[PDB]
Amino acid sequence: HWFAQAPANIALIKYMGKKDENSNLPDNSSLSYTLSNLLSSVKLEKLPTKKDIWEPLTIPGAPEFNLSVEAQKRFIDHLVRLKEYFGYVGGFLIQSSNNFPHSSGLASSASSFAALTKCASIALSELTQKPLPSIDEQAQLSRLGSGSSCRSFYAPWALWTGDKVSAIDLPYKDLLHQVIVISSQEKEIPSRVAHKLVKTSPFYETRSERAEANLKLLLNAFENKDWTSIYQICWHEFLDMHQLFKTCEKPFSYITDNTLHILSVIEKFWNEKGDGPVVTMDAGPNVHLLYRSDQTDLARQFKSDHLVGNYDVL
Amino acid sequence: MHWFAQAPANIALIKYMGKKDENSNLPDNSSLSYTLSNLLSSVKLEKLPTKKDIWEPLTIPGAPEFNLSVEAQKRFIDHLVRLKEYFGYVGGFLIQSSNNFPHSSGLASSASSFAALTKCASIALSELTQKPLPSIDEQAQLSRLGSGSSCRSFYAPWALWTGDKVSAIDLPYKDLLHQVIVISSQEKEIPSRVAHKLVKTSPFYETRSERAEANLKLLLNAFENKDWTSIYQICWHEFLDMHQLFKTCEKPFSYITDNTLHILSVIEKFWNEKGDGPVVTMDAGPNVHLLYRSDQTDLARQFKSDHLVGNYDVL
Secondary structure: OEEEEEEEEEEEEOOOOOEOOOOOOEOOOEEEEEEEEEEEEEEEEEEOOOOOEEOOEOOOOOEOOOOOOHHHHHHHHHHHHHHHHOOOOOEEEEEEEEOOOOOOOOOOHHHHHHHHHHHHHHHHHHHHOOOOOOHHHHHHHHHHHOHHHHHHHOOOEEEEEOOEEEEOOOOOOOOEEEEEEOOOOOOOOOHHHHHHHHHHOOOOOOHHHHHHHHHHHHHHHHHOOOHHHHHHHHHHHHHHHHHHHHOOOOOOOOOOHHHHHHHHHHHHHHHHHOOOOEEEOOOOOOEEEEEOHHHHHHHHHHHHHHHOOOOEEO | OEEEEEEEEEEEEEOOOOOEOOOOOOEOOOEEEEEEEEEEEEEEEEEOOOOOOEEOOEOOOOOEOOOOOOHHHHHHHHHHHHHHHHHOOOOOEEEEEEEOOOOOOOOOOHHHHHHHHHHHHHHHHHHHHOOOOOOHHHHHHHHHOOOHHHHHHHOOOEEEEEOOEEEEOOOOOOOOEEEEEEOOOOOOOOOHHHHHHHHHHOOOOOOHHHHHHHHHHHHHHHHHOOOHHHHHHHHHHHHHHHHHHHHOOOOOOOOOOHHHHHHHHHHHHHHHHHOOOOEEEOOOOOOEEEEEOHHHHHHHHHHHHHHHOOOOEEO
């Protein structure tokens, strides 16, 4: 058997799967923070069969009850893609796992494909006696399965622009990451399906331009040690994306009155303390908080004054 | 052979009330309770040759209790089945549950009973299957499935349940004096479980969780400031809110009676007179709970002497 892990990552500027389906290049650049403590793992074992089998596992290592078709479909196809790259014929039992709380949000997607790419590279390289691809190359490969995952190969910050993904040196490195858990509604639209639906939003056409412009301002804000501007820009950024969800042909939303309540409280907090956490959301209901190394107490204060007894925090 | 475990009862200052999401099973609002470490439920498990469990409640002395309940038994056994399936075990058990508090008192035994069953089954099933024993948090989550209230009994002295997480919260007061004014039940009394269902028809039910959260924020702030007077008032407002739900539903019912009102009124007057008193709460039942600070022993004895003795039974 073979094993490997990869960290999840949270994007300040969203990629959103918006890409040129010709060259497979991203329509706009994306910048993300690597969450080194949240890991996805993948164990691979050969099967006497030529077909792969996917068996997700819970933290302890017991089978996870999961009846997914779409997610499974993509994961298997990526392994097959990798086996083709190495010219390998044979099936593998795939056992993936997360070290984080599970459910209640937490996108495993990116870190899971990164771990699979890493593990299959080790396994396949050994099995076929082929050169093991470099880190940069593995990112490129993982990219083919999950765009977001290519950013999980770099730390602490990853910048994905054009045909290149790499680590980027920015002024804030050891952040405190917390997730405000907002439970999903009855028939929630999957992150990947959201990426397709937003196409009918009148603001979609100009989405990448705004993303690029936001990135330029964001980088400048980092260059100036301007945490307040980082906050405001990332704020506009994720709201921009979510607005796409509610302005398409059949409006939908992850954000609810409950989400708005805590988001509002965070604003009042920033105004009150003159400082606060950087905030962002993905194509889901959870709200992510990012605090500086010197904000541990402020973080504890906000949590005690506004999160305790109202929201679950991861 | 056999396995034995115990769990404490707990009393909520902010009520969960069984108000939960139909699909996620998460509580609509958080809940806060005091762990009553002296009131205990016990569960003994003995393996049976068959595959089916048997429930035989017992009295404090150890003799079979006369109980013809179907609903209570169904829930309790299903919880064991649930636990056995979690461990992947196949086999029946003789379940012997008991409490260290009188039947006549009419105290809710559900919460501590399910916690005890969870703990005992966890031990028993762990050794029988050679699996590791589940952590406290995992056990609480499991117990949560048979009885919402029971997950709070896995922590002390205070437990805060928010979303799918339950934990001990470090609050200023500990070693409280707990007294219960036992008010005899009326014939045809609605069970706690059913009352939680009936309140859906109250016009105030829809907005009940908003008030509970608002009260929780105030209560927590009261604790931080060591403001006992505010804890009293908030808890007062909280339980009266819930009880108003019972009498404003489709078919109004009430555990509170003129007898109850007399003593509640007395407590208020006592508070006005002394400028200090007990924290008071009520569950979906007739009894009235008093909570005093460890430094209020004399005030408590004074109130029991001057207003409880000769009028109400007290535990």
